């Protein structure tokens, strides 16, 4: 189990957590099988993967994908703060997705030889983005937790097939 194999196996835990962090949310998600609305596409302002990164069979990458993983786990970290306490009912599951999700931030920094150390863009500004996702209206507040869990599921998913295809 080389370090890279431990990276993918560690994200498998990150998603297993999002299941407990997206099952109760989707229920009263006001944006997932909910009522009185169900008309929102959820568009946070976090960094998400895309066809430009090239982390798919159609233009797979290696240094560009891994980069978005470092630069992607830092911003994700602020959103982890979002789910690292807001889940007072499943507080443990919230700490299970952020804890391991952080283990990838470190295991990646050192296991990303010839790369990593992307720093953290929008750090102090992320402090307001955290004071803004929670300061928005109840509507944009119920979508914040949702979309974030939507990136972890997909976003991290591609991260697994990217470190395995590398």
CATH 1.20.1250.10 for the 1-166 domain, yes or no: yes
Taking Cα atoms as reference points, which of 140, 146, 154, 124 lies closest to residue 49?
154
The technique is NMR
> CB of 39 within 8 A of CB of 115?
no
> CB of 143 within 8 A of CB of 44?
yes
> CB of 114 within 8 A of CB of 15?
no
> CB of 4 within 8 A of CB of 166?
yes
**Residue 76 to residues 12, 47, 52, Cα–Cα distance (Å):** 16, 8, 19
Rounded CA separation 142/145 (Å): 6
Q: If you count them, how many residues does the chain have?
A: 166
Tally of CB atoms within 10 A around 87: 19
In sequence order, the 6+-apart residues with CB closer than 8 A to the CB of 126 are 75, 78, 120
Q: In degrees, to the nearest 5, what angle opens at C-alpha 98 toward C-alphas 92 and 99?
A: 80
Helix, strand, coil content of the chain in percent (nearest 5) = 65, 0, 35
């Amino acid at each position: 189990l080389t370090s890279s194999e431990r990276i993918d196996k560690q994200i498998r835990y990150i998603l297993d957590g999002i299941s407990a962090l997206r099952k109760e949310t989707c229920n009263k998600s006001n944006m997932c099988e909910s009522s009185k609305e169900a008309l929102a596409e959820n568009n946070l302002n976090l960094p998400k993967m895309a066809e430009k990164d090239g982390c798919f069979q159609s233009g797979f990458n290696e240094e560009t994908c891994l980069v978005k993983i470092i630069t992607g786990l830092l911003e994700f970290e602020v959103y982890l703060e979002y789910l690292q306490n807001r889940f007072e009912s499943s507080e443990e599951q919230a700490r299970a997705v952020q804890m391991s999700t952080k283990v990838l931030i470190q295991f990646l920094q050192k296991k990303a030889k010839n790369l990593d150390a992307i720093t953290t863009p929008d750090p102090t500004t992320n402090a307001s983005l955290l004071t803004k996702l929670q300061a928005q209206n109840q509507w944009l507040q119920d979508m914040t937790t949702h979309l974030i869990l939507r990136s972890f599921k997909e976003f991290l998913q591609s991260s697994l097939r990217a470190l395995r295809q590398m």
